[PDB]
From a paper:
We additionally determined structures of the free hISG15 and K48-Ub2 to 2.15 and 1.25 Å resolution, respectively. An analogous comparison of our unbound K48-Ub2 structure with the only known PLpro-bound conformation of K48-Ub2 (from SARS-CoV-1)28 revealed an rmsd of 10.2 Å. The Ub units are oriented very differently relative to each other, with the PLpro-bound Ub2 in an extended conformation (like hISG15) while the unbound Ub2 in an open conformation with the functional hydrophobic surface patches exposed for binding. In the open conformation, the functional binding surface on Ub is exposed, while in the closed conformation, the functional nonpolar surfaces are engaged in intramolecular Ub-Ub interactions (arrow). Moreover, different Ub linkage types may exploit different interdomain conformational spaces explaining the source of specificity.
The Papain-like protease (PLpro) is a domain of a multi-functional, non-structural protein 3 of coronaviruses. PLpro cleaves viral polyproteins and posttranslational conjugates with poly-ubiquitin and protective ISG15, composed of two ubiquitin-like (UBL) domains. PolyUb and ISG15 have common other structural features: ISG15 comprises two Ub-like (UBL) domains and mimics a head-to-tail linked di-ubiquitin (Ub2). While K48-linked Ub2 (K48-Ub2) and ISG15 are similar both in sequence and fold, the topologies of how the two domains are linked are distinct.
Numbering used by the authors:
A (entry chain A): 1 to 73
B (entry chain B): 1 to 75
Write the structure that this text describes.
């Protein structure tokens, strides 16, 4: 399925993911598109930070859900 | 130098490491003590997951720092 990620400039990118993808897998997909290493990425959904070991479906992330990318400072 | 690792039960072990040790090397040292293969280990420090190709030095991990071992499980 497709999900969206709001990037550091507020532009939206589109990823192909599965409900069983872990957040660590999703951060690797974001690294491919944005060039930010996973250990520098905070991923936010519904106003909370996601943990690396959970799946997208563990957070009830759906088709065409939007995640937010934040850079670790 | 000495660092600590909190294991899957919350017990702490000690590792002998150098600041130049990679995280992949540290996972191999954890395998020797805990019997968990490196590809099944998530190593956490300061609330974030460490990447294999970085050194302890790259995360400013110092003597007596405590890392957290988590088992790779979806969920």
């Amino acid at each position: 399925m497709q999900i969206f990620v709001k990037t550091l400039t507020g532009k939206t990118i589109t990823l192909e993911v599965e409900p069983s993808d872990t957040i660590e897998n999703v951060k690797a997909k974001i690294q491919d598109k944005e060039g930010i290493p996973p250990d520098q990425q905070r991923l936010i959904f519904a106003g909370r930070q996601l943990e690396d070991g959970r799946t997208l479906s563990d957070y009830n992330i759906q088709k065409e859900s939007t995640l937010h990318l934040v850079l670790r400072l």
